[PDB]
Design a protein around this nucleic acid. Structure first.
Length: 110
RNA sequence: UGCCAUGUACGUCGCACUCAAUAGUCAGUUUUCUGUUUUUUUUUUUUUUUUUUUUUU
């Protein structure tokens, strides 16, 4: 968000979404606008909220995932590449209203 | 308190100071660094920093 607001794209506003987000802000994601909104979201939008009015989707293929190992006896949440099913879900999150394009910031072999 | 017999033997002398000067043996390639003063103090205690994610009579 700071990088995009430093970029200052014309007729474009920057909109976040995550789990700890305010209820009012989560409704402001849902409300209308004028122009283009670049939404930066997480597994919340991957799974639950179904943010509307999205044309294209960027998948870096990256998510923290909870984990619990026997050596450390402690819950961790490492940064791991998302699955094929997670990639397919993030891909399908954009073809709701019209034609969708999923730009994945990694390789097809990967 | 009177007397004491006669002749009877002599000379001259020495001492010192000393002694010097002597044989043969030629030569050693070119070039080089090395070098000097001056400000001096070198050294002084620090700190809290980010967030997958989702459900429970």
């Amino acid at each position: 968000a700071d990088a995009l607001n430093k970029l200052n794209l014309r007729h474009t506003e920057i909109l976040p979404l995550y789990a700890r987000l305010s209820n009012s802000e989560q409704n402001r994601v849902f409300q209308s606008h004028s122009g283009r909104r670049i939404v930066l979201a997480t597994n919340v939008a991957e799974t639950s909220l179904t943010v509307p009015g999205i044309k294209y989707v960027i998948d870096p293929g990256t998510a923290r995932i909870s984990r619990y190992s026997y050596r450390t006896k402690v819950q961790r949440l490492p940064i791991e590449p998302i699955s094929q099913a997670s990639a397919n879900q993030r891909k399908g999150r954009c073809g709701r209203v019209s034609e969708g394009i999923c730009i994945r910031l990694y390789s097809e072999d990967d």
